[PDB]
Amino acid sequence: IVGGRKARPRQFPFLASIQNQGSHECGGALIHARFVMTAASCFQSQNPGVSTVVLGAYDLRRRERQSRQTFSISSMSENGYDPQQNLNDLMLLQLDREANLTSSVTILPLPLQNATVEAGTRCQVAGWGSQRSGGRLSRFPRFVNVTVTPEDQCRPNNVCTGVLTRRGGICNGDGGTPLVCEGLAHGVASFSLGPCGRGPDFFTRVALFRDWIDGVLNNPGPGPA
Numbered sequence: 001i002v003g004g005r006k007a008r009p010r011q012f013p014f015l016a017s018i019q020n021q022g023s024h025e026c027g028g029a030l031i032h033a034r035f036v037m038t039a040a041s042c043f044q045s046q047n048p049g050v051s052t053v054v055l056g057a058y059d060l061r062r063r064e065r066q067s068r069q070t071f072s073i074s075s076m077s078e079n080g081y082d083p084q085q086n087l088n089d090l091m092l093l094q095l096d097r098e099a100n101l102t103s104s105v106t107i108l109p110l111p112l113q114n115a116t117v118e119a120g121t122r123c124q125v126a127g128w129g130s131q132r133s134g135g136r137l138s139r140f141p142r143f144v145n146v147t148v149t150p151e152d153q154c155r156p157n158n159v160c161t162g163v164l165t166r167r168g169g170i171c172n173g174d175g176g177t178p179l180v181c182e183g184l185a186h187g188v189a190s191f192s193l194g195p196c197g198r199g200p201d202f203f204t205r206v207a208l209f210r211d212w213i214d215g216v217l218n219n220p221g222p223g224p225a
């Protein structure tokens with residue numbers, strides 16, 4: 001995150017940290033005691049989904065034993081994700097077991113199917129991503145205040161944003177992290193236009209996948225084999 005402030009512990013308790021061999025690859029949000037919503041695109045590979053999921057974190061550098069919760073991924077689900085054009089970049093992770101709902105870990109609610117957010121609306125995005133193109137991750141979470149742009153510079157499958165001050169927005173490590181507006185997860189950080197903090201951050205429209213998500217939540221099994 002570029003152009004933002006440092007958060008306080010438990011300021012965003014829904015927040016997840018997806019890791020690989022202990023290193024932070026992407027963000028996410030806890031949407032159900034057993035699922036984490038994130039970007040499908042975090043899911044390229046080079047050691048594919050052999051990842052972990054850390055809840056309750058703050059300082060990426062410490063163990064924070066009495067606040068964190070660690071989990072492995074039993075399954076992963078997506079709806080028509082397409083990498084060439086980045087369409088439908090959304091994926092749900094099923095945790096090996098129920099997350100204990102504490103003061104440092106909570107659920108982020110979801111908008112109803114087909115809902116919308118008008119241009120000009122104020123939202124926030126937060127994460128442990130870097131502050132500059134190809135730069136170190138942030139050890140603590142940071143957040144910035146965003147504003148939803150007019151539909152003509154976005155895309156239908158997305159919900160775009162900008163900052164009144166040059167430089168603000170997502171950056172490396174911020175992928176999968178949620179855009180919250182009006183206390184609901186209206187977005188899933190996908191990709192960004194050019195130099196971090198420059199102009200039009202693209203987020204996946206969560207309101208389009210609502211019934212599908214409900215679908216997965218309701219019949220929790222690993223899928224066919």
Ligand SMILES: *[C@@H]1O[C@H](CO)[C@@H](O[C@H]2O[C@H](CO)[C@@H](O)[C@H](O)[C@H]2NC(C)=O)[C@H](O)[C@H]1NC(C)=O
Nearest residue numbers: 112113114115116156157207208209210211212
């Ligand atoms: C949400 O909106 C869509 C479009 O207004 C409604 O139906 C559409 O969905 C059908 C099933 O996918 C499609 O066959 C149409 O192509 C499709 N159009 C778009 C572009 O998606 C849908 O009924 C609405 N649902 C509710 C719950 O409001």
Ligand SMILES: *[C@@H]1O[C@H](CO)[C@@H](O)[C@H](O)[C@H]1NC(C)=O
Nearest residue numbers: 068069070097098099100101
């Ligand atoms: C709460 O969940 C944790 C982490 O998943 C688990 O190890 C623990 O047993 C649960 N706590 C209580 C006191 O049972």
Ligand SMILES: *[C@@H]1O[C@H](CO)[C@@H](O)[C@H](O)[C@H]1NC(C)=O
Nearest residue numbers: 003004005006143144145146
């Ligand atoms: C968020 O917005 C509020 C209200 O405009 C403001 O007081 C605060 O500085 C903003 N924070 C960031 C981190 O941009």
